[PDB]
Amino acid sequence: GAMWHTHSEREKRVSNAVEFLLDSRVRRTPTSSKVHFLKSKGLSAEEICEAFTKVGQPKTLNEIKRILS
Ligand SMILES: COc1ccc(CN2CCc3c(c(C(=O)NCc4cccc5ccccc45)nn3CCNC(C)(C)CO)C2)c2ccccc12
Numbered sequence: 001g002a003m004w005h006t007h008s009e010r011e012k013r014v015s016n017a018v019e020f021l022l023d024s025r026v027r028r029t030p031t032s033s034k035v036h037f038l039k040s041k042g043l044s045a046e047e048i049c050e051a052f053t054k055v056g057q058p059k060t061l062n063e064i065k066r067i068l069s
Pocket residue numbers: 012013016017019020023025026029033034037038041042
């Protein structure tokens with residue numbers, strides 16, 4: 001395939017990002033580092049935003065975009 005943009009691949013990205021963010025060591029890593037790392041795993045800004053909300057550590061999309069800029 002499935003292509004990057006398809007829902008099956010978006011869902012693998014966001015669900016893997018959620019697992020990542022839940023790890024206890026990852027919880028003690030700063031936001032910026034985690035955002036750049038999620039970009040390196042293929043997530044868009046909006047998908048990164050989704051993942052952070054899913055784990056109860058919401059960031060604004062503007063904040064995510066700023067970090068990635
Ligand atoms: C930016 O900061 C960090 C980066 C990386 C690490 C090392 N790992 C951590 C656990 C971790 C990682 C990853 C990890 O890298 N998962 C893969 C992945 C993540 C995000 C988006 C993806 C999108 C497409 C494909 C894979 C993706 N996952 N856990 C926890 C869960 N482990 C499994 C897979 C068994 C599910 O229960 C990476 C870090 C380790 C400690 C602190 C910071 C870290």
